[PDB]
Write a protein that binds this ligand. Structure first.
Ligand SMILES: Nc1ccc(-c2cc(Cl)c(Cl)c3[nH]c4c(c23)CN(C(=O)CO)CC4)cn1
Ligand SMILES: [Zn+2]
Length: 328
């Protein structure tokens, strides 16, 4: 209870120092974006909005930032790869013809040029050095792919109006490989909008009478994983897990507990325990549905070994029964 709020305060004091570092990262980005704009192939490159840096996977490592460069392109048509609901080949119907390999757009070819232009100056295409990961993403203004039709189950939490409005925004495709020329769907912009506008009430966390602990629970779940990943970094059974798994599980708990009253700031310990319990259930049953693509199991044996899940299950059960020693 009091231990949880002490961790958040230590995290908060850690964030203030990078306020000056933000402009330092934001300077390198504003430059690199201009240099990429001079190449004919990257004319329509820009920052993925709502903030230059998305502050990486690590809540406990403010030294490393994460930035996404979106590439506006003509109308995209997609071909699903091998029944994997998230990976696709990209096809056309001007300057990107150089990266064409028949009809399929070559991720390896565009990444190689993306890297060459920056060097002289693929989930992260380049990592600069205080680290900065840069991801190239294709912007598509088409309707969201069919695999997202039963995802984003926010209707009883953020309303069906908002889900309708959110699904009118573009989606994004990042060169991730399953096959070395597929692209992976990305909804980082939607995830940020949900986190920063998270309550059933439109004025959640806008006044002191409506302070919920939704954000604090996510910070704590991210800190728990990073601490465990750092403690057991040499054991290799936690390499697969990332903050995306914790964020995904958190969004399911929001769907599961849609009322702001279920996230009262004075129930932080119970609310954090709700997220820990749901994340364990996903580990034990090896089922963590992608929040936007319900058929993509993030905890499938294809992606993460069963022994890794029960290792993490074992460690989280330990921390839970010992009142989380890795926090102090
Ligand atoms: N093996 C994996 C893991 C996950 C996915 C994945 C899948 C979908 Cl559909 C979406 Cl929308 C995704 N967004 C992100 C990921 C992702 C993975 N990811 C990280 O793990 C951060 O280090 C970036 C953020 C596909 N393959
Ligand atoms: Zn709130």
């Amino acid at each position: 209870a009091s231990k949880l709020r002490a961790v958040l305060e230590k995290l908060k004091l850690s964030r203030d120092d990078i306020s000056t570092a933000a402009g330092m990262v934001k300077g390198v980005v504003d430059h690199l974006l201009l240099r990429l704009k001079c190449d004919s192939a990257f004319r329509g490159v820009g920052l993925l909005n709502t903030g230059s840096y998305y502050e990486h996977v690590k809540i406990s490592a403010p030294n490393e930032f994460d930035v996404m460069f979106k590439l506006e392109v003509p109308r995209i048509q997609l071909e699903e790869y091998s029944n994997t609901r998230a990976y696709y080949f990209v096809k056309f119907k001007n300057p990107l013809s150089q990266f064409l390999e028949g009809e399929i757009l070559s991720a390896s070819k565009m990444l190689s040029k993306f890297r060459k232009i920056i060097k002289e100056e693929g989930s992260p295409a380049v990592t600069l050095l205080i680290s900065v990961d840069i991801t190239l993403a294709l912007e598509s203004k088409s309707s969201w792919p069919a695999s997202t039709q039963e995802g984003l189950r926010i209707q009883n939490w953020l309303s069906a109006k908002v889900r309708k409005q959110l699904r009118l925004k573009p989606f994004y495709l990042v060169p991730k490989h399953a096959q070395e020329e597929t692209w992976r769907l990305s909804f980082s912009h939607i995830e940020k909008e949900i986190l920063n506008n998270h309550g059933k009430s439109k004025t959640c966390c806008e006044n002191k009478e409506e302070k919920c602990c939704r954000k604090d629970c996510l910070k704590l779940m991210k800190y728990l994983l990073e601490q465990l990943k750092e403690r057991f970094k040499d054991e290799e059974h936690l390499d697969k897990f990332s903050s995306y798994h914790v964020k995904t599980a958190f969004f399911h708990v929001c769907t599961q507990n849609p009322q702001d009253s279920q996230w009262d700031r004075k129930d932080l310990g119970l609310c954090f325990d709700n997220c820990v319990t749901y994340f364990l259930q996903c580990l034990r049953t090896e089922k963590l549905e992608n929040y936007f693509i319900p058929e993509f199991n993030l905890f499938s044996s294809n992606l993460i070994d069963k022994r890794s899940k029960e290792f993490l299950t074992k460690q989280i059960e330990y921390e839970r029964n010992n009142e989380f020693p890795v926090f102090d």
